[PDB]
Amino acid sequence: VAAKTLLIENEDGKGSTRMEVQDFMKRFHMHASEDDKTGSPSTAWGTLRFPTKEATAPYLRLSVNDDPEDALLFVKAMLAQKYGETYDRPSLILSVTGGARNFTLPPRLETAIAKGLRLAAQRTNAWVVTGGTNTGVMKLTGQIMEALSKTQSHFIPPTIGIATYGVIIGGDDMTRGEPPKIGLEYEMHKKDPPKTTPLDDNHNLFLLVDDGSTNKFGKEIKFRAAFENAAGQAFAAPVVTIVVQGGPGTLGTALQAVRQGTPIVVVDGSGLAADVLAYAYNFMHNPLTRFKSYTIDDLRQKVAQTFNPKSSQQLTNLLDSALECVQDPNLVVVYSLQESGIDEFDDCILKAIFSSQGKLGNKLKQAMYFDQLDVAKRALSEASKNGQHNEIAACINDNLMAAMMHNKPHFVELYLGFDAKIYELKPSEEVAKTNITALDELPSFALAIEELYKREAKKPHSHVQRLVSLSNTDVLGRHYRGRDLANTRAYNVLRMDQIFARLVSKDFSVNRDFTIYDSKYDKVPGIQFRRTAQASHMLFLWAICLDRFRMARHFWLIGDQSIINALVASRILERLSTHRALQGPHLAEERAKMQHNAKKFEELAVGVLGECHGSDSHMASEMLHSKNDMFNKKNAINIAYDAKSLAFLSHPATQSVINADWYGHLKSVTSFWAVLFAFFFPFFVLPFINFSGAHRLRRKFAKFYSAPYTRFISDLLSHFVLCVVTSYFVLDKLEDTISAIEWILLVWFVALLLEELRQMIFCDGIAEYISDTWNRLDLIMITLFFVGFFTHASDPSNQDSKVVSKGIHAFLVVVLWLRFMRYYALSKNLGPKLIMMMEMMKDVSTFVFLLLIFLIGYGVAAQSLLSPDEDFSSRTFIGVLFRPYFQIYGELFLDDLNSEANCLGDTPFTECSRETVRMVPFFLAVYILGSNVLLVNLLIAMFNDTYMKVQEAAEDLWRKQNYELCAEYKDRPFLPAPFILLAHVHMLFMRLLRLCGVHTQEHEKIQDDETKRKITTFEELNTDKFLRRWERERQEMLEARVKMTNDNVVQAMGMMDQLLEHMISFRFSLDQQA
Amino acid sequence: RVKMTNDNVVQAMGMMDQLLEHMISFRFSLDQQA
C-alpha cells in the first residue's frame, strides 16, 4: 500500500510531524524542458523496484533550484517511514567519487576497499553518496554496499545516488505515473533514445536532479555537494571523500573538496588521477625513499600519460590542480595496499575523520564507532601531552555516556583510566526539578543513569519498557499502582532499585545514601571511594538491566562487596530471564543467552569464595559474617538463601561458616554427646572448656546458651520428655477423676499451642506458617490432644469415654513420635535419607496404585468364591479388605482358609463341599506371584533408579535445610517448651517495653573500620587472583588453543601472501630494472 | 602436541615477519640502488 502520511522533521530538530505525501513533496519541483526556469512541482517520486532485488528503493526527482535541506528532510522522512522515528542517525557521509567510465581494479585493493567501506558502513551507520549510475566507481560502490545489505539485518545503511535526470535511462518511464509509484519496475535493459546511462540497482535511494536538459552529465555535482554539506550540518557528521581512479573532473572535484575543507581519501593502486594525486602526495608530503625519486616533471609525465591533455597549458593547470589538491597534508589521506595494509582502509577513514574539522569529543565518538582503541588512546595521550587536559576532560563526559550507550567496555575502561571520576557523570539534558525531595536529593550521575534508561527504553521491542509497564508501582517505588512524573521521571533510580529489590525477593531491600555526594563531605577520608562504590553499584545494576555482560564485569571488578553483588546479579538475571515481561519472540535470544550469562556470575561468585578458601579460612569466616550496610545489614549467607543459590550454599567454605554459626562460635564442644554432657553438667564443664573472671565466665555461659545447638538440644530434650510422659500417660489407665499428669500435659501442650500461635500470628504470617509440613503436624497434634482431652473431660466417670480418649490419643502418640523424626535433619547421615525418602514416596504411591488393583480384584473374587451362599454385610467387606493384605506381607493364612473352606480331606484342599471352592489356592498363587515377586521388586528397581537419580540433589537440599534449620533455631526462644509460655511472659515484658512503658533500649555491635578495610582489601586481592587464574584457565583450555593457533595460521597465511606479493613486486622491479 | 604446534606456529610467524622485514629492506635497497 502507498503511504499517505509521512513524518517530516521540524526546523527545531526535536520533533517530527505527520503530513501528507503531496503536501510534503510539493516543495520538490521539476523541469520539463531546458527553457523552463521555475518549472512544475514534481510528479515523479516514489518507490522503484530493481530486478533481482527484494526491496524497492525510493526515488525522488528534485529541481536544480530546489534546496538540498528539503531533500535531506525527505530522506529523513523516508528513513522515518522505513525504520520508525527512532532511526539510526549517521556519523559519516562517505562521498564515493571517481571515474564514471569502467575502472578495473586489482582484487586485493578492491577487496580491501570494499571491506573497509562495508566495515565503516556497518560500524558508523554511514550514508553513501555516489553517482548512482551502474558504471565504474558507483557500480563498485554499489557492489561494496550490496554485501552489507544482505549480511546485516534491522536498519540498513542507505546508498543514496545523486544523478542527473537527462542522462538517467527510464526517467520518462518514471515521469509517466501518478505519484507515489508504489513499486514501479525499473527496466535497465530498456532502449531509451536520449538517455543511455542506467541507474545502479544496489543504490538504496535516488536523487534525480532535473534542470530540464537531456544527455548531460555534471549537472548534479553541486546539488550532491550541497546535500552532503546539509547532511554534515544536520547530523553534525564529518564528510569523507573516497577517491578511486577518476578523471580531470574528479581532480577538480577533489580540489573543490580540499577548498571546501572536506578531507579526501585517495586509494593508491587504482590508477589514473588517484595515482597522480597519490604521486603528488608522495612528492609533496612523504619523505620516504621510494617517494624521494618522485619529481614534479615525473608527476607531469604521469599526468600526461594518464589524463593526456590537448595543450601544455592544460597539463600545467592539471599539475597545478594536483599540487593544490595535495597542498594541505591534513585534507589528503593516501591509502595503499603495499604501504598501509589489508585492514587499514577503515583506519584511513578514521585518520581522515581525525584530520577533519576537529572537535575532540566528536573524534572520540568517531573512534568509539570505528572501535580502534589504540588510536583514541594515542590521541588522548597526545592531547594530555599538549597541555589540553581541560578540553579533554570537558569532553570525556559525553564520550563516556556514548560509550555506555553504544556498549564498548574497552572504551569505558579507557575513559575510566584517563583521569575521570565515575561519580562525576552529568546528563546531556537538564532534569526538571520536582516537588518531591527524593528526586531533589538525587545527584547528576543518577540523572545520567536515568538518561541511559530513557535512551535504552526508547528503542523498539525493548524489554525495559515492558518491565516498567508491568511493574505496577509508583515513582517513589511503592507498589500502590503526577502523570508527568510518571512519564518523564519514571526511570528514576530509586524506583528502579525498588523494582530490583522486589525482583530479588519479597523481603529483599537495598539502601542507598546520596549524602556523601555533597561537597561538604569532600574532606572526609574514603568518601570518594564510597562514591565510586555506590556509582559502580548503580551502573552495575543498570548493566544487568541492559544485559551487557562485559560492562557488568567491569563495574563488578571496580566495585566493592563483589560476592554479594554477584549473588544478587545471578539471582535477578536468572529470575528476569524467566519472567512475563520478557515474553515475546523478538526478545527471544536475550531471554536465553543472558540466562547463560546469569550462570556465568554464579560460577564467578563460587570462585571468589574458592579464592577466599584458597587464602584463609578464618578471614573467609570473618568475610561471611560481615553485614553489608547497603543491604539492610544482612550477612551474605542470608543473601544466598534469599537469592536461592544452591551451588553457593553447597560449598564447604559456606558449610564451615554455617557450622561456625552453630555451637555459638565456640571451638571446644562440637560433638553431640559433648554438648549433651555440657548441657547436663553446666558448672563442671564451662569453666573447664576453652574460651571463644566471674563476668567473663558469665559471658561464656551466655555465649553457650545463646547457641542454636543448645536451644536445639533443649527443644529435643523437651520433645523427648514430652513423648516419654505422654507414653506413660497413654499406656497407664486413666482414673475416675482428672489426674495431675493430665494437668501437666494440659500445661505442656498449652505452652506448645501458645508457642505455635506466637510462631503463626506475630512472627511470620499465616500463609508462611501454613506452607510448612511440621507446623501442620504440630497443629494436628494440638487438635488430637484437645479432642482426646475433651473426650476425657466431658465424662470423667464413664469407662467408655476413657476408651474413646485413649483411642483418640493413640493418634497423638503416633503423630508425636513421628514428629520426633523432624529433629534428624541436623545429622549428616540422616537428613539426605529423609530427603531421599520424601523423593521416594512418589514411587511408594505408584506401588500402592499398582497393588490396589490386585488386592481389590483378588479380595472381591476370593471372598465371593469362598462364600457363595451369603448375604452382603459389613463383614464381607472386612473379609475383602483384610486377609489379602496380610497375604502380601507374609502371613498366608491357609489353615484358616482350609477351616473357612470346610474341606475335610487329609490333603489340605480336598474332599470339599463346593467343587469350585478348591480354586482359592490358584488365585492365591497368582496373587502372591503378582504381589511378592512382581510389584515389590519393581519397587526395588524404582528405589535404585530413584536414589541414583536424586542423591546429590538431596544433598544440596540438605545444605539448604541446614542453613534453614540454623536460621530457624537462631531465632528460637532461649527457654525450652514448658518454660516457653513463661518466656512468652518475658515477651509480654517486651510488651511492657513496647507501648505503655516505652522504655525499650536496644543496640547493635559496630565493626572496626580497619577490619572492614582489611576485608575489602582481602576481597579485592582474592577477586584479582581469581580473575587472573580464571583468565589463565580459560586460555589454557583445548578449544581456545586450537582456535588461537587457527587464527595464527590464518594471520601467518596472510603474512605469507603479503610476502609473496612483495617478492613478486621486487622480481617485477628487478625485471624492469634490467 | 597442540601447545608445541602453537609455539611452533608463533615461532614461524616471527620468522615470517623477520623474512618480510628482510624482503622489505632488500626491496628498499633495490629501490635506492636504482
Ligand SMILES: CC(C)CCC[C@@H](C)[C@H]1CC[C@H]2[C@@H]3CC=C4C[C@@H](O)CC[C@]4(C)[C@H]3CC[C@]12C
Ligand atoms: C481359561 C479360562 C480363563 C476360561 C474360562 C474357564 C472357566 C469358565 C472354567 C474352566 C474350568 C471350569 C471348572 C471345571 C470343573 C468344575 C467342576 C464342576 O463340578 C463345577 C464347575 C467347575 C469348578 C468349573 C467352573 C468353570 C471353570 C473354571
Ligand SMILES: CC(C)CCC[C@@H](C)[C@H]1CC[C@H]2[C@@H]3CC=C4C[C@@H](O)CC[C@]4(C)[C@H]3CC[C@]12C
Ligand atoms: C487363567 C489361566 C492362567 C489358566 C487357567 C487355569 C484354570 C482355568 C484351571 C487351572 C487348574 C484348574 C483346577 C484344577 C482342578 C480342579 C478340581 C476339580 O474337582 C474341580 C475343578 C478344579 C478346581 C480346576 C478349576 C479350573 C482351574 C483353576
Ligand SMILES: CC(C)CCC[C@@H](C)[C@H]1CC[C@H]2[C@@H]3CC=C4C[C@@H](O)CC[C@]4(C)[C@H]3CC[C@]12C
Ligand atoms: C512355578 C510356579 C508357577 C508353580 C506352579 C504353581 C501351580 C501350578 C500350582 C500351585 C498351587 C496349586 C494348586 C494347589 C491346590 C489345588 C487344590 C486341588 O483340589 C486342585 C488343584 C489345585 C487348585 C492346585 C493347582 C495347581 C497349583 C495352582
